[PDB]
């Protein structure tokens, strides 16, 4: 259905809302939800942990089998698995972990994966424990993505910072 409510347009194809991505997914039932994954699809903290926990670990069991069969992802890469109760599909995208010396230029490759899907609900990539500046992350998203992305940012203080840096 993709019934997003209450978003602000930052550009013709990029929208933002002050919301929890899990709560949004449950209420919007999007075609694609994006996960901020690592290369072994171990969903231990941050957004990955929260999305997995909302599937009652169905996402981790499916991920372990994917890795066993196909091997790990590369930084900047992605795979499409089941969305379980959150969406039709989950796009697991690996942004660079700046804290661990992964190259920030790969954030652009990470966001390019979004262009394979017409509508996505997504978090900001490489924010949080991955260590990237979230405003920088949004800037790359807006420069790189050409499809329709609905971004959910939970922290109100961060949300207000982003909105005023863009508008």
From Swiss-Prot:
List locations, semicolon-separated. Host endoplasmic reticulum membrane
| Effect annotated for changing residue 164 to L | In strain: Gamma/P.1
Where the record annotates domain Macro, the positions are: 1-167
The UniProt entry lists membrane topology as: Multi-pass membrane protein
User: What is the regulatory mechanism acting on its activity?
Assistant: Inhibited in vitro by GRL-0617.
Q: Which reaction does it catalyse?
A: Thiol-dependent hydrolysis of ester, thioester, amide, peptide and isopeptide bonds formed by the C-terminal Gly of ubiquitin (a 76-residue protein attached to proteins as an intracellular targeting signal)
Its biological purpose is as follows:
Responsible for the cleavages located at the N-terminus of the replicase polyprotein. Participates together with nsp4 in the assembly of virally-induced cytoplasmic double-membrane vesicles necessary for viral replication. Antagonizes innate immune induction of type I interferon by blocking the phosphorylation, dimerization and subsequent nuclear translocation of host IRF3. Also prevents host NF-kappa-B signaling. In addition, PL-PRO possesses a deubiquitinating/deISGylating activity and processes both 'Lys-48'- and 'Lys-63'-linked polyubiquitin chains from cellular substrates.
This protein's assembly is summarised as: May form homohexamers. Interacts with N protein.
The name on file for this protein is: Papain-like protease nsp3
The protein's organism comes out as Severe acute respiratory syndrome coronavirus 2
């Amino acid at each position: 259905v993709n019934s997003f409510s209450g978003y602000l347009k930052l550009t013709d194809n990029v929208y933002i809302k002050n919301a929890d991505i899990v709560e949004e997914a449950k209420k919007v039932k999007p075609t694609v939800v994006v996960n901020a994954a690592n290369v072994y699809l171990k969903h231990g903290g941050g957004v990955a942990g929260a999305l997995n926990k909302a599937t009652n670990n169905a996402m981790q069991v499916e991920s372990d089998d994917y890795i066993a069969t196909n091997g790990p992802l590369k930084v900047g890469g992605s795979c499409v698995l089941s969305g379980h109760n959150l969406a039709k599909h989950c796009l697991h995208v690996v942004g660079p972990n700046v804290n661990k010396g992964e190259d920030i230029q790969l954030l652009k490759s990470a966001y390019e994966n979004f262009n394979q899907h017409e509508v996505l609900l997504a978090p900001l990539l490489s924010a949080g424990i991955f260590g990237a500046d979230p405003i920088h992350s949004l800037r790359v998203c807006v420069d790189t993505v050409r499809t329709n992305v609905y971004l959910a940012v939970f922290d109100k203080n961060l949300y207000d910072k982003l909105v005023s840096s863009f508008l």
